[PDB]
Design an enzyme around this catalytic site. Structure first.
Site, mmCIF file in Angstrom:
data_model
loop_
_atom_site.group_PDB
_atom_site.id
_atom_site.type_symbol
_atom_site.label_atom_id
_atom_site.label_comp_id
_atom_site.label_asym_id
_atom_site.label_seq_id
_atom_site.Cartn_x
_atom_site.Cartn_y
_atom_site.Cartn_z
ATOM 1 N N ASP A 131 -76.350 47.516 77.912
ATOM 2 C CA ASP A 131 -76.687 46.128 77.487
ATOM 3 C C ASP A 131 -78.231 46.083 77.398
ATOM 4 O OD1 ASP A 131 -76.332 43.584 76.507
ATOM 5 O OD2 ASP A 131 -75.286 42.853 78.301
ATOM 6 N N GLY A 132 -78.707 45.153 76.619
ATOM 7 C CA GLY A 132 -80.117 44.902 76.377
ATOM 8 C C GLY A 132 -80.354 43.388 76.341
ATOM 9 N N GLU A 136 -81.338 47.029 73.131
ATOM 10 C CA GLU A 136 -79.942 47.428 73.061
ATOM 11 C C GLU A 136 -79.775 48.929 72.781
ATOM 12 O OE1 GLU A 136 -78.206 44.829 70.150
ATOM 13 O OE2 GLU A 136 -78.100 43.257 71.775
ATOM 14 N N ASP A 194 -71.125 45.656 73.867
ATOM 15 C CA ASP A 194 -70.788 44.451 73.115
ATOM 16 C C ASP A 194 -71.881 44.179 72.073
ATOM 17 O OD1 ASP A 194 -73.040 43.521 74.510
ATOM 18 O OD2 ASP A 194 -72.128 41.654 75.058
ATOM 19 N N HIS A 202 -67.590 38.158 76.127
ATOM 20 C CA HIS A 202 -66.918 37.504 77.246
ATOM 21 C C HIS A 202 -65.713 38.205 77.809
ATOM 22 C CE1 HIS A 202 -64.416 36.725 73.737
ATOM 23 N NE2 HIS A 202 -63.450 36.465 74.605
ATOM 24 N N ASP A 214 -75.605 43.620 81.830
ATOM 25 C CA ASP A 214 -76.168 42.330 81.365
ATOM 26 C C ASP A 214 -77.155 41.834 82.448
ATOM 27 O OD1 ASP A 214 -76.844 39.853 80.377
ATOM 28 O OD2 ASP A 214 -74.930 39.006 80.853
#
Length: 155
Positions: A10-11, A48, A70, A124, A134
Site C-alpha cells: 500500500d502507498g 504505491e 488494492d 474495503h 495502509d
C-alpha cells in the site's frame, strides 16, 4: 511454511505533491518482513509502486509470488499499459517518456526475475495484511525521512 512468497502493498500521500509513504509485508522463507518509509515530497502513485519495488527487490532467488494490492494504478499499469510501453520504448503517443518511467522500469526489472500471480483486492475488503500496509503507509507519511529523487512536476 509457505510454498509461495506472499507480498502485500500500500502507498499513501498527503498531497499532489506531498509527503507520503509506503508499507509492504513480505512472507519470505519462514519470516515476515515489514518495509515502510516516508518521503518528503512525492505522489500517491509513486508511493504505491515503491511498495511493490522494495518488496520484490528483497528477493534473492527466482520465486513464485502472489502480490496483493488494492492499487488501481498498479493494476492499470500491469494489465493495460506496461505491455504497450515496452514495445514503444517507454514513450507516450506524443513521444515523451512515460510518467514515472523511473519507477515503472525499476519495477519491470524486479517482475522479470519471478513468476507473479496478481491479486487485486477491493479497498474495503483486503486481508488484515493490506490494512496493516495502509496503516504503515499512513504512519510513514506523517514522518518523512527520505527524498523521492525520481519525482518531477515535469515529465
Amino acid at each position: 511454511m509457505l510454498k509461495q512468497v506472499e507480498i502485500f502493498t500500500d502507498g499513501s500521500c498527503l498531497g499532489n505533491p506531498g509527503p507520503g509513504g509506503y508499507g509492504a509485508i513480505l512472507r519470505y522463507r519462514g519470516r515476515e518482513k515489514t518495509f515502510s518509509a516516508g518521503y518528503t515530497r512525492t505522489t500517491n502513485n509513486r508511493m504505491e509502486l515503491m511498495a511493490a519495488i522494495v518488496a520484490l527487490e528483497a528477493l534473492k532467488e527466482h520465486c513464485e509470488v502472489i502480490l496483493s494490492t488494492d492499487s488501481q494504478y498498479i493494476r492499470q499499469g500491469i494489465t493495460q499499459w506496461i505491455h504497450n510501453w515496452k514495445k514503444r520504448g517507454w514513450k507516450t503517443a506524443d513521444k515523451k517518456p512515460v510518467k514515472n518511467v523511473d519507477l515503472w522500469q525499476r519495477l519491470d526489472a524486479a517482475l522479470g526475475q519471478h513468476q507473479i500471480k496478481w491479486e487485486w483486492v477491493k479497498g474495503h475488503a483486503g486481508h488484515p495484511e493490506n490494512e496493516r500496509c495502509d496503516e504503515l503507509a499512513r504512519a510513514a507519511a506523517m514522518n518523512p525521512t527520505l527524498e523521492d529523487t525520481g519525482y518531477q512536476v515535469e515529465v
